[PDB]
Design a protein around this ligand. Structure first.
Ligand SMILES: *CCC(=O)Nc1cc(Nc2nccc(-c3cn(C)c4ccccc34)n2)c(OC)cc1N(C)CCN(C)C
Length: 283
């Protein structure tokens, strides 16, 4: 578990990329013969000892899965010490996959979506082998390096399970409800199986080309809806077989939820025959 502390001076923080509640991400160049494009994250209220603890937590969680890694999981490049702690991570040039599936909504063939789902299961399965619960699997949180290369990011909420710990006990802060499993909302319990549901939802995000899930339903009513047994709809483009998968991720019995290993097998199987499973217009 190693951090690489990098010299504040070598970065020229070009512009911002997008600010959240949690923090603010900047693109910028890093020039230690070549120049390297990078992304830079620092949290809101970056002077506070709570907001310097959480960012170094993120850096830790991230660095103790760096080796050997996985081509579908962003690596830390290091951190910068200024007045605050900055997290450096190589710039994905095509941005998040949510943004993507919107802008390019009319030119994405089945072979891409179905490959992305395998790449993401691959990203997550490794993480699981590394005893890490991402806690925030979304489409906003999937960076595109190239159309055949997608990577997972944002370990703000990510946590590590102890040697014999099965689940994580969230001292509820601010969490993204419409991505969480039932048991994650009621009892604040997070599992690998809780990331499966998040995947399930993220899948739904992509298939719909970046629709907002449970649109215009207030956060509150969500758990209720789910307890009724209401799930997100079957997207227009998807057959039953693909939707049947999404619907397994969302089952109350977390241990009846499919595994990331099972998902790679399933989505590869489909990704080999992309048009048999997804009906895109003009595909
Ligand atoms: C979905 C929003 C998004 O990520 N958008 C962009 C991402 C870019 N690249 C990039 N590369 C590495 C890491 C990150 C990154 C990680 N985290 C936690 C981020 C939060 C906010 C923004 C970026 C984050 N991002 C990127 O560089 C090409 C551009 C974007 N833009 C184009 C999307 C604008 N978005 C605010 C709506």
């Amino acid at each position: 578990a190693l951090l690489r502390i990098l010299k504040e001076t070598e970065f020229k923080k070009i512009k911002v990329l997008g600010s959240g509640a949690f923090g603010t991400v900047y693109k910028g160049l890093w020039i230690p013969k070549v120049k390297i494009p990078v992304a830079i994250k620092e949290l809101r209220e970056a002077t506070s000892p709570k907001a310097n603890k959480e960012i170094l937590d993120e850096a830790y969680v991230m660095a103790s899965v760096d080796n050997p890694g996985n081509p579908h999981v962003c690596r830390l490049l290091g951190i910068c010490l200024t007045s605050t702690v900055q997290l450096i991570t190589q710039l994905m040039p095509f941005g998040c996959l949510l943004d993507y599936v919107r802008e390019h909504k009319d030119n994405i063939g089945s072979q891409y979506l179905l490959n992305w789902c395998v790449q993401i299961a691959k990203g997550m399965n490794y993480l699981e082998d590394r005893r890490l619960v991402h806690r925030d699997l979304a489409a906003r949180n999937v960076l595109v390096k190239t159309p055949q290369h997608v990577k997972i990011t944002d370990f703000g909420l990510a946590k590590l399970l102890g040697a014999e710990e099965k689940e994580y006990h969230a001292e509820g802060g601010k969490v993204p409800i419409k991505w969480m499993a039932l048991e994650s909302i009621l009892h604040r319990i997070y599992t690998h199986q809780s990331d499966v549901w998040s995947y399930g939802v993220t899948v739904w995000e992509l298939m719909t080309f970046g629709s907002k899930p449970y649109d215009g339903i207030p956060a509150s009513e969500i758990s209720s809806i789910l307890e009724k047994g209401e799930r997100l709809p079957q997207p227009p483009i998807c057959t039953i077989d693909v939707y049947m998968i999404m619907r397994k991720c969302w089952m109350i019995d977390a241990d009846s939820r499919p595994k990331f290993r099972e998902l790679i097998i399933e989505f590869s199987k489909m990704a080999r025959d992309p048009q048999r499973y997804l009906v895109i217009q003009g595909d």
